[PDB]
Design a protein around this nucleic acid. Structure first.
Ligand SMILES: [Zn+2]
Lengths: 59, 94
RNA sequence: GGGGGACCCUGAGUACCGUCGGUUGGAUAUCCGGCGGGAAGCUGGGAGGCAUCGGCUCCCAACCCUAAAUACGUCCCGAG
RNA sequence: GGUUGCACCGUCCGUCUUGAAACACGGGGCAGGGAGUUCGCGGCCGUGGCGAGGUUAAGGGGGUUAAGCCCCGUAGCCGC
RNA sequence: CAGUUCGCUCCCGUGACCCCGGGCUAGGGGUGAAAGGCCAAUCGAGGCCGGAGAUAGCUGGUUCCCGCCGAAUCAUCCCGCAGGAUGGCCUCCCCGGAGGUAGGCGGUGGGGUAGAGCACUGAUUGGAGGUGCAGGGGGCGAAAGCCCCCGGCCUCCUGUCAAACUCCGAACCCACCGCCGCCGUAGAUGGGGGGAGUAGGGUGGCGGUGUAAGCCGUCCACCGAGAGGGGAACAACCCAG
RNA sequence: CACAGGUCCCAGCUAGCCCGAAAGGGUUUGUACUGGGGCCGACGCCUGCCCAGUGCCGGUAUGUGAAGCCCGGGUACAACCGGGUGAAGCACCGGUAAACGGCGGGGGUAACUAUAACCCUCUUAAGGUAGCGAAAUUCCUUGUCGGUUAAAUGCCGACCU
RNA sequence: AGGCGUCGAAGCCCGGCCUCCGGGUCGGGUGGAGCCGUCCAUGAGACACCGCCCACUCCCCGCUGUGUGGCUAACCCCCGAAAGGGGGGACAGCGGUAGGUGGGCAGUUUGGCUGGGGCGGCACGCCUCCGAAAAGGUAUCGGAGGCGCCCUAAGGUCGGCUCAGGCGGGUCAGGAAUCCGCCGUAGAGUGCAAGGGCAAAAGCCGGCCUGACUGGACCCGUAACAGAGGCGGGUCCAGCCCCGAAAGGGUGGCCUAGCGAACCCCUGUGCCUCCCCGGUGGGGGCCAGGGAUGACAGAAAAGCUACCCUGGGGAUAACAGAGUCGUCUCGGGCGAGAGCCCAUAUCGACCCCGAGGCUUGCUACCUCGCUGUCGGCUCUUCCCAUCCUGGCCCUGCAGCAGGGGCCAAGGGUGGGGGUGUUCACCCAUUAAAGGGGAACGUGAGCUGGGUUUAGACCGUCGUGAGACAGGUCGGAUGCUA
């Protein structure tokens, strides 16, 4: 027979690939070396809307 | 059908009539050392479909009787005629 | 260039065994490869179409090179 | 010999089919092309050689413009 | 005009809207608001070269002339039924030597069809006679039984039958003998070898089946494979090869 | 067909699902108000019974269960024969129907001689509950009754065989 | 048949523990010379001694694996350019092997006969009777039936007897229990279908036995004529045997059914053989018996296609033609009976003889390298078995009307409702509102409502793909004569 949608999604075609260029970037913590044994201050500069995140993001 | 346990018949080894005990041949499984079984096992290995027929549920309603008559003086067993098929076979003493 | 020795050397995950796939006429007795195991090494080792024991015969792997007789014709001479 | 007149007869061609003029299939005309070939093995026959024997294959020698021609070649095969 | 166009009519026309440039997804794969839709006029698996001169028991075709002989569609087996094999039937060559038999006459044997018949088996109308025979209706009961209709069985008379009946029984056919006839030493009967084609038959009489047409066998006479003369033409009918 | 809305299933992330020969990879610059897999299809009122069958999920004391391993026999060694252990899976047990599907049949019964059954008794797992009904589903069929026409194989309303 | 004893014991007193707490043992002391059995009983005798053990159970050590808990150093995952850190951890992953699950993905099969195919059935392997036509042979989805077993006796042989049914007689006893006479050609039985054969037997009752055997030859049938693997049967030679006095008979059932290749495997039995030779384990070969293919001269085997494709077939179905007329329409013969009497004004039972080809059916003769369907519209033509119109006859014909029949085909035979409808039903008119043929007239004239592709919904059936002479919406009509 013919393929399923789930089967076709595993080949990473543009029909199924996520558009990870409209987004603001991944939100990961700073490297553990800075955070462990030391405490860092930071200032919130901007709050904006991430196209695909379901949550607002901040700088 | 009822059959005697012993009957006196011509013995090809004694060359005269002697008492013989009646026995039924008992089937045995295929010997793994035979040439046919060796060939069958050799071909079965590897990739491919089953290389031999697989008859299913093929068996006559009643089979013939494979009997052997063992002389009571020589101890040798000989065959006697061609078998006949019956579904009941009771050996009766005498 | 020949006779003696009593001392030394002669190729290892190799030969080979079990198992699996392929290949072969190779049939319990072809060859290649994978997986587990794996020697003697000159007071030595291998082969003789199932396996083993004894006799007899032949040979010395696991390193390398080697012209001529052979295949073809993008081409040439010659012939039908 | 060309054409035509009269008397009588005559429903085209190839094909499958029991049966074709067929309301069964293939048929506008002309010219060229077009369909039991080659090898291997086996059975037969027509003819010819030798004959309890027959025959050479690969190949070799002589001669030649040449692959023709001449001679050898007992491996092998069949028969006994 | 066009391997999907033209006119009128009609629907959407701020949105899941329409269109250009640059890119990505490729064949058991892509893509699909899911119609097996679309993927360069090709989609229930694209196109191009290659395997490849694929294979078919199925369709079509198969090229000069005259001479001689000349069939068959039926028995057995096959996943056999539009196809094959072994036989039967045709043709060509050879050996081997003295007989052979399609027709007829007589004889020695076999048969159970047509017809006929009831002696077996099984049916079939009525009348007479004899039987309690475990019928059944009633009269007739302390029980033991008898008095009649009716059912059955047997014999006779009377009127009818049979593919799966026969006490009988042809025409006719078959085997063998003797003879006539015919063929054969210009080599038959018979034997060995080479090559086939034939496995759909039709009409005509007979038999089983069917309302009939027809279906299935049998007879080998004619067409198939056959001219000429006729029945108006006609496959089969008549004369005639 | 899609759609918004409803509900069900898998997954705590080295996950779940998927493409590949492998290496690697899509969902993923993602993290349960998320990613993936089914069905129904705005909205209003509702969604009854059944787990025996098939499917799936959990358990598995016990039976079976391949190789390997162990023991006895055999072979101056093997091939070979008989037993013990033996995972998954089956057998067994339990949940599960907005999972696939199923939701009949008889014996009957009350103010006639009226039909039907409030109600009892067997039958398989249980016997179709609210609704709707000659329906785009009804063979008899142009069912029967009423409206529409002078005339109705039509359309509409009703009965439920 | 005796054993121990200063090579130290009873008989009392404490304690741990196994435990059927039966009751056996054990560390300590008072203890200072004796205690069991040989005896008997017990299916089997000694806690008299000496042996290897039998079943449950404990433990010291070496090895072996299974499970649990922990550790880091292999291996993996994370941050980081790296150095280095964190998380997991002998799990995972990877490589080899073994079992299961597995339409996710492939290659295939899913037979034939058939008055077309499908369902049905088996005429698909055998036996008897008829078909069958008096030698042999002879087919159909021809007619009436059986077989796929059973029997150590229902087999071999020897002797003796004669059956079914009936009549007469006899206690219980009756139709039927067991008995005595007569008749009795088989009307009984012979294992089972049918046919054939059987009377001092092939039947019933008994005695003995296992020829239902081994090694072979030839011949007939399946399968005539006329080819055959396999199979069945018949006539014999030899060996060893059974019955019988003897002749004679016995190679299964009185004859005709009851069954099956290659390869492979099992069993018996003696031999030959395995690569230079010999021994051993094992294998190979010859002969005999056995395991089966019922589609029965022998594949291992499920479906849909309406998305379908290819090669063919009029060897074969649907529409139309052709043959036939069971059926259909129409007509006739007799006259029971009904008609107040009167068969025939009218009807015409039961039965019998016909016409047409206007309904349906049957056959498979022409047409599958295409002869385009039903209905409707348009238009032409023909038959009479005459609906109206013209002319008549009988009447249970007073008139007006009716019923039946005859001659007659020039003319007419219309309009509407539901339904695709032909048809049938209904409405208002009318003289009447007749039936039929022409490729069921007429699509190189038209329309396309139904039938009959490709899309979709409902009911039922199927596990599913899917199907329905069950409904429903949509769905193309080519032309220069
Ligand atoms: Zn003996």
């Amino acid at each position: 027979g013919k393929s399923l949608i789930q089967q076709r999604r595993g080949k990473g075609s543009p029909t199924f690939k996520s558009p990870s260029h409209r987004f603001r970037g991944a939100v990961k913590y700073i490297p553990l070396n800075y955070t462990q044994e030391k405490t860092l201050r930071g200032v919130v500069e901007e709050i904006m809307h991430d196209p695909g995140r379901t949550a607002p993001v901040a700088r | 059908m009822k059959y005697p346990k012993q009957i006196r018949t011509y013995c090809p080894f004694c060359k005269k009539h002697t008492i013989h005990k009646v026995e039924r041949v008992k089937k045995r499984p295929r010997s793994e050392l035979s040439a046919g079984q060796r060939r069958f096992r050799r071909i079965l290995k590897g990739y491919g479909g089953f290389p031999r027929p697989k008859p299913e549920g093929r068996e006559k309603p009643v089979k013939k009787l494979d009997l052997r008559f063992r002389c009571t003086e020589c101890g040798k067993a000989h065959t006697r005629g061609r078998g006949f098929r019956v579904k009941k076979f009771e050996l009766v003493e005498g």
